[PDB]
Amino acid sequence: VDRAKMGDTLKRRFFYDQAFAIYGGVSGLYDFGPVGCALKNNIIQTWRQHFIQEEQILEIDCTMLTPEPVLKTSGHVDKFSFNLMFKTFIGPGGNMPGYLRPETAQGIFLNFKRLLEFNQGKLPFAAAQIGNSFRNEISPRSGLIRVREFTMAEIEHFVDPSEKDHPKFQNVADLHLYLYSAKAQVSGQSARKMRLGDAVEQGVINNTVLGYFIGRIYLYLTKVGISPDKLRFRQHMENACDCWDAESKTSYGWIEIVGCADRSCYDLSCHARATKVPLVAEKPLKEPKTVNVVFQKTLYVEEVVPNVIEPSFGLGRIMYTVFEHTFHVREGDEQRTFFSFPAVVAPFKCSVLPLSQNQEFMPFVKELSEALTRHGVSHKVDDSSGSIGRRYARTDEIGVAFGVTIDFDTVNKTPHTATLRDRDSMRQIRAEISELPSIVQDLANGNITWADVEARYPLFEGQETG
Amino acid sequence: VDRAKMGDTLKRRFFYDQAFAIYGGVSGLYDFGPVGCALKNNIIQTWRQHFIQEEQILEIDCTMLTPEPVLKTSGHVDKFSFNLMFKTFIGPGGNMPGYLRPETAQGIFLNFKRLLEFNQGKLPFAAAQIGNSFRNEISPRSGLIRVREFTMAEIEHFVDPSEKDHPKFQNVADLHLYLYSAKAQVSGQSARKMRLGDAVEQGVINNTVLGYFIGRIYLYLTKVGISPDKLRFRQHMENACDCWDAESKTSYGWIEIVGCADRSCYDLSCHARATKVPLVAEKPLKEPKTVNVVFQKTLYVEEVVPNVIEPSFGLGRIMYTVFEHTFHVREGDEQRTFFSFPAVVAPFKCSVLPLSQNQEFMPFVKELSEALTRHGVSHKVDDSSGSIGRRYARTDEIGVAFGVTIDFDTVNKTPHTATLRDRDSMRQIRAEISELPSIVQDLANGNITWADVEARYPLFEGQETG
RNA sequence: GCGCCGCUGGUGUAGUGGUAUCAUGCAAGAUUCCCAUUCUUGCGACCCGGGUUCGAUUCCCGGGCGGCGC
RNA sequence: GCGCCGCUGGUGUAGUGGUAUCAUGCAAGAUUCCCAUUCUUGCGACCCGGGUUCGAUUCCCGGGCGGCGC
Ligand SMILES: Nc1ncnc2c1ncn2[C@@H]1O[C@H](COP(=O)(O)OP(=O)(O)NP(=O)(O)O)[C@@H](O)[C@H]1O
Ligand SMILES: Nc1ncnc2c1ncn2[C@@H]1O[C@H](COP(=O)(O)OP(=O)(O)NP(=O)(O)O)[C@@H](O)[C@H]1O
Structure with missing residues (x-):
């Protein structure tokens, strides 16, 4: 209105x-x-x-x-x-x-x-x-x-x-x-x-x-x-x-x-x-x-x-x-x-986001970007001084459908799991960064809904590293 | 020239x-x-x-x-x-x-x-x-x-x-x-x-x-x-x-x-x-x-x-x-x-072709068309008075990359196998119509070449029914 | 632009001052049963206008467009 | 079109006949370590022209554009 x-x-x-x-x-x-x-x-x-x-x-x-x-x-x-x-x-x-x-x-x-x-x-x-x-x-x-x-x-x-x-x-x-x-x-x-x-x-x-x-x-x-x-x-x-x-x-x-x-x-x-x-x-x-x-x-x-x-x-x-x-x-x-x-x-199906302006976040952002590109998914890599939420609000404005955040648990745990965050609902689930682009494609093509994703995957309780 | x-x-x-x-x-x-x-x-x-x-x-x-x-x-x-x-x-x-x-x-x-x-x-x-x-x-x-x-x-x-x-x-x-x-x-x-x-x-x-x-x-x-x-x-x-x-x-x-x-x-x-x-x-x-x-x-x-x-x-x-x-x-x-x-x-990645103006060829042409469409592959369905080769020459003019022909062996044999025919080479291999659109996609996207297809699949010896 | 020759089925062409040849192609029925099969049948055209003319696709004037010369 | 009020950082605004306020936003360093955190620092604007004027973002004339009335 x-x-x-x-x-x-x-x-x-x-x-x-x-x-x-x-x-x-x-x-x-x-x-x-x-x-x-x-x-x-x-x-x-x-x-x-x-x-x-x-x-x-x-x-x-x-x-x-x-x-x-x-x-x-x-x-x-x-x-x-x-x-x-x-x-x-x-x-x-x-x-x-x-x-x-x-x-x-x-x-x-x-x-x-x-x-x-x-x-x-x-x-x-x-x-x-x-x-x-x-x-x-x-x-x-x-x-x-x-x-x-x-x-x-x-x-x-x-x-x-x-x-x-x-x-x-x-x-x-x-x-x-x-x-x-x-x-x-x-x-x-x-x-x-x-x-x-x-x-x-x-x-x-x-x-x-x-x-x-x-x-x-x-x-x-x-x-x-x-x-x-x-x-x-x-x-x-x-x-x-x-x-x-x-x-x-x-x-x-x-x-x-x-x-x-x-x-x-x-x-x-x-x-x-x-x-x-x-x-x-x-x-x-x-x-x-x-x-x-x-x-x-x-x-x-x-x-x-x-x-x-x-x-x-x-x-x-x-x-x-x-x-x-x-x-x-x-x-x-x-x-x-x-x-x-x-x-x-x-306009953009996904957003590669780190948690903070930290160095040990680079390679996963780069590799994810390149992997999405291989998988042909239009994405915004956002990595600035900004707090995670500022970048969230910046990406939500332009209606980026989903948002990957790579964090400490992604780096400091054996199966490299990052989080996928749903625009409309703000909610999020956690999956290994190795298969994430597939989920984002599947999402961008209706074959799976967000409800589908929340079903098939663990939710998100918290983050445990630093 | x-x-x-x-x-x-x-x-x-x-x-x-x-x-x-x-x-x-x-x-x-x-x-x-x-x-x-x-x-x-x-x-x-x-x-x-x-x-x-x-x-x-x-x-x-x-x-x-x-x-x-x-x-x-x-x-x-x-x-x-x-x-x-x-x-x-x-x-x-x-x-x-x-x-x-x-x-x-x-x-x-x-x-x-x-x-x-x-x-x-x-x-x-x-x-x-x-x-x-x-x-x-x-x-x-x-x-x-x-x-x-x-x-x-x-x-x-x-x-x-x-x-x-x-x-x-x-x-x-x-x-x-x-x-x-x-x-x-x-x-x-x-x-x-x-x-x-x-x-x-x-x-x-x-x-x-x-x-x-x-x-x-x-x-x-x-x-x-x-x-x-x-x-x-x-x-x-x-x-x-x-x-x-x-x-x-x-x-x-x-x-x-x-x-x-x-x-x-x-x-x-x-x-x-x-x-x-x-x-x-x-x-x-x-x-x-x-x-x-x-x-x-x-x-x-x-x-x-x-x-x-x-x-x-x-x-x-x-x-x-x-x-x-x-x-x-x-x-x-x-x-x-x-x-x-x-x-x-x-311009068209494939061509659905029957062998001849016969009736028991219809359902496979329709189902193939619909299946390619599901699989999002641009195709020409050609079905006329024309001999198989006239339709071949008609489809080759416009550079249709490959051509499926559904025949008698497709109808009269248990695994429903039709043939895939390579434009440039005119050669052909035979595969089940159930997985054909996947081969045509894979072809249209470089991940497999025609050499790849000829390798992975039987060639084409002949046709045995009528 | 300017100069040159041109224009007829979808495509390639024959021909003519009394509205059109052949090939192809497309369609239908047969005939084929894996690379423009074959027989029959059907469809479809004189670039546009003006002039002269009884009458123009034909001849002439002008435009359009194309093949080419700078 | 015609009529009406309008225009100042990217966005939202204060203000003035001697070139500009505040917010935001973007950047940098820190600070954060999952939803525009916080401190410091930096960047960036008077729609265009004409008139009058010593001098115009300010006043007036004309264009542009926008919000709206048919
Ligand atoms: N009349 C035309 N017909 C088709 N394509 C054209 C035409 N004019 C220009 N182009 C295209 O436009 C492109 C660039 O235009 P143009 O300005 O002529 O070239 P450029 O990059 O400026 N320098 P240059 O090409 O050497 O003149 C070229 O690559 C052509 O393919
Ligand atoms: N000035 C415009 N700005 C944006 N879109 C337009 C504008 N004018 C026409 N359209 C679009 O063009 C479409 C059809 O044009 P228009 O001829 O006006 O409608 P229509 O199908 O002819 N009949 P109608 O739409 O009832 O007038 C509409 O669906 C519009 O969305």
Whole structure:
């Protein structure tokens, strides 16, 4: 609830700073520091594993420059003296004007033919694109909530309009979500907690494709740690072809984070009629159709124009909501604020910490660091004048998921055992430094929870050496 | 050597297509398809693991828009009627002009204070940035070699000018590299194959920092599969403060791929004098200095201006060189071209293949797919009218590292054994489908080579069922 | 940039002032049963516009893009 | 955008027409020896420019940026 506090923490530690502060900044442009960049990357990687990996989506890398004709066709050029897109010129100035793309989606549309081709002309397939987009907003505001350059992650799901049904829907059908349907909106009611499947077999949500995507969108948002309770999907009123967008409860109110938008025969077609190049899938007929025109003209393939589900992920806003949702303040010392980053998307998975500024602590810190690096675990080595707890508070601020402390009992006892300390709970268990990185991986990957670790291992009574 | 062939393959299969081909394209702008995007991502991930992970570098996410004052200070604005940067306007047009950044480096410079701060004010530290950059080239050409929007990956290494020596240099000191020093250039000679260490303790390369970075740059380029033989580091003549850039032998000649440039007191300072904000590290004195001025003014900290090593990685050109270097054509059927993508950066690590369009092959294809996905291995399921070999040739084109074929002996024998087939060699071994994904991971991660697999497992004599 | 020749299925090409050849490739059914098998069948293209024209993919003017010369 | 109040170490602030208070934080040495210990010491700032002025962080004009009203 305390954005003053949260923000102070985020700024002091360079999660994200205002861009070009040195030159007195610029509105709506923000640079992400080390910790924020680590978090952002983790979120993105998680998104790739949760969507691209899970659905065999075809990620592509289109460019951010986009010539005026393209956006005329799309209807952005007309959608706005001056207009809300960054306008520039390509080449020797003059006759080829252009813009910085307002969304990553269009690239997937002007490549539909080669993408379908790659999918052996078959349907239904999905192609995605993660990348930055630029709106030249008159009044940017609210930190990351409305900026001028942000990172989108879009998925275009091309599916035969007829075959709108999903094989894997049963994997999300039994989820309990908050749904803010259109009726409930105009009928003055709040959102409702439905089992997903039911919401589909009550016609609230058209089909099991839309449903499926909603379910996994939900699962993803909660995976990275957006509170389930401050997350609803709000159907679009008489305001879309059938949008349903995921919003979160922030201090700036309910905010759009992911826009899942089922457009039918839309962008593709406008592009086709523009360029005169046809964009279509062909589906074989299972019963060929002789058409006696006047001779007999037999048809073997129906010329399908696919429907498209367009989930647009706002990385910026999702990141911010992970902030506001996972920002806590400790009992007692209220100077110690922490970030309950879910383990898998933590900026740093571990912290190598000695007990005190002592020399006989060096080799275990070095060897642990190197061993975590071998094991590929992102870690912060912190070793200063600071008391153990100062370093704890320093590491908790940036939401380091767990913390290894190497101590005297680690040095002065035969099985070299150091301690692992859980961020959120502050509690700790003791294990041999030889296997610790494995525990930290296993932790960072959900296969074991902290409860799992507390179970499998001795707790921590005390320390007996000096 | 055959760029007609190579290119045909790259284009047909949408590694990268010319941008906005539908609207008749645009020069110097290229979109990367599924396979190219997969490869690109793999390269980037490998770069992060090889540099950021290995050196605790501080990756940040700066923006691509950059106001005119910044680039005036940097001296890009002056560096060129019209000039070679994409110019746009930020906000209500008018009085705040700007550009699309010509490099990602500057962001790391205008944030130096917070980055140093994060590093506890200590030296020497490194911060990186992966991201796109834009040159408005008059004549873009040669596919990816010279474009208008590309992906850079830059590292700024800030180090005290005095303490220019590297603890880990002994890890690269014993490498054998091709060095094209300045003398050899003006003295009409070719490059020379030196042991790295020697080249440093002969003064050819100033110091062991520069050296270290050269060594790991080399290791990285060869990791992703640039031929060692078509790779040299060319020192800058009387042409830099001490540049040494890695170039590769392509069909377009020797091309710059990575620009490692040791600038001294350069960018930081110009920025500081511009904004009047000081950019400096402080180093404690180990013997305080009382300075009798006229009273006694004791100094405890010397005000250091760090030197900066600037390796600039050209993702585009590196990608292209991986293409030209790893593009082969099979013995016999010269329609079958393949890509010897090193296992770790392959676009797809595996291919689930049945033997023929048969029904009793389905469940093993599905279960294998799902099992690889569980095991997080990027794979292509290919199951068509096609003969086994047509699918082989189809999968070899895109450089799928290995290929599982499920057959009759897999179905009609008690331990369910399918075959693993090595791309480059076409040879194959047989293992139970229950443990196959582990072998494919282990393969994709260097811990086991193909020789390792051929050793640990039975070969492949034949198939006995139908 | 400027100069030179160019553009026809996804790819490689034939050809023409009355809307198109062959190969490949992709799809379907068979046929295969470990390395682009084979037969049948199906899908798919004249870069964009302007000019002249009854009519242009063809001829001419202009843009786009590519192969190359500095 | 327009309107409103604002800007001083990294962060939070005091104050003034003669260049700066306190807290924090970061650093060093000690002191601790498992949760911002304590003492000493050190580092670091008036958003930018213009005007008036002997002189501006202070006063005024203009830009930048932020907190908010539509
Ligand atoms: N100025 C901005 N700052 C940060 N994120 C933005 C900004 N503008 C758009 N987005 C993101 O872009 C996504 C979709 O863009 P947008 O077109 O506005 O929504 P949509 O899917 O078209 N329909 P809707 O979101 O209801 O307008 C949203 O989910 C946002 O998270
Ligand atoms: N038009 C381009 N297309 C693709 N890559 C480019 C292009 N321009 C620059 N690069 C990449 O950018 C990197 C460095 O840019 P550049 O400034 O030209 O070199 P550098 O490190 O400054 N010194 P030098 O490369 O010798 O000019 C190179 O390694 C290239 O790979």
